[PDB]
């Protein structure tokens, strides 16, 4: 009676994802990880509150065999807009469950919200490796 | 425009409702600012 979902995913799905990616970033060749749904949040210290940004999209990490070595992209589904940013090796990360927190230039605070906390964990692990490996 | 119900039985989906992030104690904010500052 009970049935478990297949852990392995079809290769066709992976190919399709990379196809959409190329549409915005011609130099994205491989996908490292993808989160079904991720949103960008910023913190304003003056007010002591969190403000949601206009970027709500599927989050993908792209790998390339040329500079930049690694870059992160969010496909904004609601606004049909592309937002890209390169990965630097000076960023410091922190994990406050279930929301991921990181620090940015000029003492600013920004974080990422994921549909599932575990899903966020996997993505974060990748970034940590890049920071310590190059 | 829509008015949320005062009493709720089960958690239902509501399009347009922003999630509420948890706020840490003041110490967290201060610590971050200092580390970045030199």
From TrEMBL, chain A:
Entry's localization field: Cytoplasm
GO MF assignments: enzyme activator activity; identical protein binding; mRNA binding
Domain of life: Eukaryota
A Gene Ontology biological process term: mRNA processing
Annotated keywords: Cytoplasm, mRNA processing, Nonsense-mediated mRNA decay
Primary location: cytoplasm
Family under the similarity heading: Belongs to the DCP1 family.
Protein name: Decapping protein 1, isoform A
Organism: Drosophila melanogaster
Gene giving rise to this polypeptide: DCP1
From TrEMBL, chain B:
Subcellular location: Cytoplasm; Nucleus
Domain 5-3 exonuclease XRN1 DCP1-binding motif per the UniProt entry, residue ranges: 11-36
Top-level division of the source organism's lineage: Eukaryota
Family: Belongs to the 5'-3' exonuclease family.
Organism: Drosophila melanogaster (Fruit fly)
Protein name listed in UniProt: 5'-3' exoribonuclease 1
């Amino acid at each position: 009676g009970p049935h478990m979902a297949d852990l392995m995913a079809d290769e066709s799905i992976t190919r399709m994802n990379l196809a959409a990616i190329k549409k915005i970033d011609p130099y994205a060749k491989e996908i490292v990880d993808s989160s079904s749904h991720v949103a960008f949040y910023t913190f304003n210290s003056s007010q002591n509150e969190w403000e949601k940004t206009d970027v709500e999209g599927a989050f993908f990490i792209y790998h390339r065999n040329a500079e930049p070595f690694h870059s992160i992209f969010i496909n904004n589904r609601l606004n049909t807009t592309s937002f890209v940013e390169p990965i630097t090796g000076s960023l410091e990360l922190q994990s406050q469950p279930p929301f991921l927190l990181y620090r940015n230039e000029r003492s600013r605070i920004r974080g990422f919200w994921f549909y599932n906390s575990e899903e966020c964990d996997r993505i974060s692990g990748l970034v940590n490796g890049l920071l310590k490996s190059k | 425009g829509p008015q949320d119900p005062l009493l709720q039985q089960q958690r239902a989906p509501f399009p347009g409702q922003m999630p509420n992030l948890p706020k840490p104690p003041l110490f967290w904010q201060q610590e971050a600012q200092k580390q970045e500052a030199l």
